[PDB]
């Protein structure tokens, strides 16, 4: 015995299920923010077409953090147990906030960046 029907449907601005960027994984950090926003912003970005992740992964190429400094995020990075093939980018929410209003991965002139081991 068995039965069913199920249904389908799709409607959007040319984007049924094709992440705009297949190399723009943005990871929002709850620390110094919360869930609401974290999830919100994270969801907002996705809506733009970005590939946001609830949990850190090797796919994470960009890590967002509000208030937190590149150091704070860094220390956390090392604190993580996930292995990354290439250290992700650390930028302030200001980037994610823009990346949204920009619907694209705004350029990183630095202001967006939190901090890095840059000397020279």
From Swiss-Prot:
Subcellular location: Nucleus
Record domain BRCT: where: 16-113
Family note: Belongs to the DNA polymerase type-X family.
Function: Template-independent DNA polymerase which catalyzes the random addition of deoxynucleoside 5'-triphosphate to the 3'-end of a DNA initiator. One of the in vivo functions of this enzyme is the addition of nucleotides at the junction (N region) of rearranged Ig heavy chain and T-cell receptor gene segments during the maturation of B- and T-cells.
Subunit structure: Interacts with PRP19 and DNTTIP1. Forms a ternary complex with DNTTIP2 and core histone. Released from this complex by PCNA. Interacts with TRERF1.
Record's protein name: DNA nucleotidylexotransferase
């Amino acid at each position: 015995g068995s039965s069913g029907s199920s249904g389908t449907g799709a409607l959007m601005a040319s984007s049924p299920q094709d992440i705009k960027f297949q190399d723009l994984v943005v990871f929002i950090l709850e620390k110094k923010m919360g869930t609401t926003r974290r999830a919100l912003l994270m969801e907002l970005a996705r809506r733009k077409g970005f590939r946001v992740e609830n949990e850190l992964s090797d796919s994470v190429t960009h890590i967002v953090a509000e208030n937190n400094s590149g150091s704070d995020v860094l220390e956390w990075l090392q604190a993580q147990k996930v292995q990354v093939s290439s250290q992700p980018e650390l930028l302030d929410v200001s980037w994610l906030i823009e990346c949204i209003g920009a619907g694209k991965p705004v350029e990183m002139t630095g202001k967006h960046q939190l901090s890095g081991p840059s000397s020279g």
